[PDB]
Swiss-Prot record, chain A:
Other remarks in the entry: Present with 7330 molecules/cell in log phase SD medium.
Function: Electron carrier protein. The oxidized form of the cytochrome c heme group can accept an electron from the heme group of the cytochrome c1 subunit of ubiquinol-cytochrome c oxidoreductase. Cytochrome c then transfers this electron to the dinuclear copper A center (CU(A)) of the COX2 subunit of cytochrome oxidase, the final protein carrier in the mitochondrial electron-transport chain. Isoform 1 (CYC1) is the predominant cytochrome c during aerobic/normoxic growth.
Organism: Saccharomyces cerevisiae (strain ATCC 204508 / S288c) (Baker's yeast)
Induction: By oxygen at the level of transcription. Expression drops rapidly when the oxygen concentration falls below 0.5 uM O(2).
Listed name of the protein: Cytochrome c isoform 1
GO molecular function, one term: electron transfer activity
Stated consequence of mutating K77R: Loss of methylation by CTM1
Keywords, alphabetical: Electron transport, Heme, Iron, Metal-binding, Methylation, Mitochondrion, Respiratory chain, Transport
Gene3D superfamilies the record matches: Cytochrome c-like domain
From Swiss-Prot, chain B:
Record protein name field: Cytochrome b-c1 complex subunit 6, mitochondrial
Family: Belongs to the UQCRH/QCR6 family.
Organism: Saccharomyces cerevisiae (strain ATCC 204508 / S288c)
Subunit structure: Component of the ubiquinol-cytochrome c oxidoreductase (cytochrome b-c1 complex, complex III, CIII), a multisubunit enzyme composed of 10 subunits. The complex is composed of 3 respiratory subunits cytochrome b (COB), cytochrome c1 (CYT1) and Rieske protein (RIP1), 2 core protein subunits COR1 and QCR2, and 5 low-molecular weight protein subunits QCR6, QCR7, QCR8, QCR9 and QCR10.
Further remark: Present with 4490 molecules/cell in log phase SD medium.
Keyword Ribonucleoprotein belongs to the record: no
Superkingdom field: Eukaryota
Disulfide bond positions: C28-C50
Membrane topology: Peripheral membrane protein
Gene: QCR6
From Swiss-Prot, chain C:
Record's function text: Component of the ubiquinol-cytochrome c oxidoreductase, a multisubunit transmembrane complex that is part of the mitochondrial electron transport chain which drives oxidative phosphorylation.
Residues on Mitochondrial intermembrane side: 43-57
Gene Ontology terms describing biological process: aerobic respiration; cellular respiration; mitochondrial electron transport, ubiquinol to cytochrome c; mitochondrial respiratory chain complex III assembly; proton transmembrane transport
UniProt subcellular location: Mitochondrion inner membrane
Entry keyword annotation includes Cytoplasm: no
Annotated TM spans: 17-42
Ubl conjugation is among the record's keywords: no
Matches recorded under InterPro entries: QCR9, QCR9_sf
Subunit architecture: Component of the ubiquinol-cytochrome c oxidoreductase (cytochrome b-c1 complex, complex III, CIII), a multisubunit enzyme composed of 10 subunits. The complex is composed of 3 respiratory subunits cytochrome b (COB), cytochrome c1 (CYT1) and Rieske protein (RIP1), 2 core protein subunits COR1 and QCR2, and 5 low-molecular weight protein subunits QCR6, QCR7, QCR8, QCR9 and QCR10.
Name of the gene encoding the protein in the UniProt record: QCR9
Protein's recorded name: Cytochrome b-c1 complex subunit 9, mitochondrial
From Swiss-Prot, chain D:
Physiological role: Component of the ubiquinol-cytochrome c oxidoreductase, a multisubunit transmembrane complex that is part of the mitochondrial electron transport chain which drives oxidative phosphorylation.
Family indicated by similarity: Belongs to the cytochrome c family.
Assembly and binders: Component of the ubiquinol-cytochrome c oxidoreductase (cytochrome b-c1 complex, complex III, CIII), a multisubunit enzyme composed of 10 subunits. The complex is composed of 3 respiratory subunits cytochrome b (COB), cytochrome c1 (CYT1) and Rieske protein (RIP1), 2 core protein subunits COR1 and QCR2, and 5 low-molecular weight protein subunits QCR6, QCR7, QCR8, QCR9 and QCR10.
Other noteworthy facts: Present with 39900 molecules/cell in log phase SD medium.
Organism: Saccharomyces cerevisiae (strain ATCC 204508 / S288c) (Baker's yeast)
Binding residues for heme c: M64
Intracellular or extracellular location(s): Mitochondrion inner membrane
Protein name, UniProt field: Cytochrome c1, heme protein, mitochondrial
Gene that encodes it: CYT1
Cystine pairings recorded for this chain: none
Lineage top rank: taxon: Eukaryota
Taxonomic path: Eukaryota, Fungi, Dikarya, Ascomycota, Saccharomycotina
Amino acid sequence: TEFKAGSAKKGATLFKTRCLQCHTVEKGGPHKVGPNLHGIFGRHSGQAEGYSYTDANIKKNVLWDENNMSEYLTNPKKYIPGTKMAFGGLKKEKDRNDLITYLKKACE
Amino acid sequence: VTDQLEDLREHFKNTEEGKALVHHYEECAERVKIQQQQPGYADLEHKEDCVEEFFHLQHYLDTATAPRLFDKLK
Amino acid sequence: SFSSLYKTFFKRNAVFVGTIFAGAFVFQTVFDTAITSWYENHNKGKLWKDVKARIAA
Amino acid sequence: EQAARAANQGALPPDLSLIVKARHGGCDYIFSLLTGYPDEPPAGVALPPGSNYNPYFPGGSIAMARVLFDDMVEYEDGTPATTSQMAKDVTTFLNWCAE
Amino acid sequence: MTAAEHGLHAPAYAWSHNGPFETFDHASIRRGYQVYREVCAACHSLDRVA
Ligand code: HEM
Ligand code: HEM
Ligand SMILES: OC[C@H]1O[C@@](CO)(O[C@H]2O[C@H](CO)[C@@H](O)[C@H](O)[C@H]2O)[C@@H](O)[C@@H]1O
């Protein structure tokens, strides 16, 4: 229950500057360095068709929700060791809460 | 503790010279924003950009922040 | 280089090769130590030795 | 190289062992590049999909995005990990790698 | 050559290793390695360093 709803506006800026380089959010969006994230919540990790994930990501088999997403974004390689995702991590809970809030709205 | 270079850059954007330069860039930006709204903008081959104005601004900021930044760092 | 000072050691003769070579050996040692001490002191705090000491915790 | 490019939309991140000596500007250029990404490119500049604007890079269009952000690293010695501090420290490390 | 094509001139920062009598700041090198490992290493190799 750690995830708290925040500003979707601030989350969009975080996605633009921190995730947009490797990810897309629109439905039917193309894959880049990372797989398209539409429909990520409520779905298990490493299942987007057309993208080649690492065995570490697939074997993780995480059913994505707001809370484990928060822990993942804090330190990706610590949560899913052996993953291709190269991210710095959001140490501040406010950043995570805002980013996830935007992500929830982006795929509704 | 916010970024020391960001602080210094913000400070110098506020000097008289810094404000004149941001003004010149902002004026170019507005002019470009208008050109884009015009019909058949995609077909011009002589589209103006504001790189030069942005460069003048950045060069001025660099000239002021470069010799001061490291005294603020570890 | 005072005439009297030079004469006390060399009496109007030029310095001979053997003494030049011997003097070069001593110079090499003293000069290196002198330069090294000055150089390390001028950069005190930046050297690994100084940083390794700082990491006491 | 194939794997490298596949992980960076076709671009190849160069080895950094000699980057400081392999670029005009040396430490100044490396530092200015890492701390020189504006939030948006100057007006009228069409940035090729997948590119990032940085005035210090010839042509302004670079395949590397800004990667340094405040506090992304926790310095062992207590030093505040600001963007400029990290850029200064990594550039110094890279200068040592090269020389 | 236009300004854009050439790239903005990088200004002169006061690196503590600038100057004939100056060594590198080894604490800065140490910290810089950490930045390389945690950030740069994901995309950048350092092949010539043993
Ligand atoms: C905070 C910004 C980011 C968010 C919210 C984010 C989110 C995600 C999520 C939730 C996944 C899991 C995908 C799945 O299981 O279907 C993922 C995978 C991935 N992401 Fe990101 N990401 C971000 C930034 C980045 C960046 C900057 C890059 C590129 C340098 C990147 C590269 C990847 C890759 C390569 C994968 C695949 C992992 C694997 O197969 O091991 N991501 N990302
Ligand atoms: C603070 C850590 C990093 C440092 C010090 C660094 C440094 C550099 C430098 C100096 C260049 C050369 C630019 C030139 O040609 O003048 C470069 C290019 C590049 N970097 Fe990085 N980088 C870092 C992290 C990253 C990360 C994490 C990635 C992958 C997500 C990345 C991807 C690239 C790419 C794709 C290029 C090629 C750019 C181009 O030629 O258009 N870099 N980097
Ligand atoms: O490939 C990166 C991708 O990010 C975007 C997001 O809008 O570019 C923005 O963020 C970059 C990261 O620093 C900036 O360099 C760029 O100027 C900014 O527009 C995409 O435009 C770009 O393809």
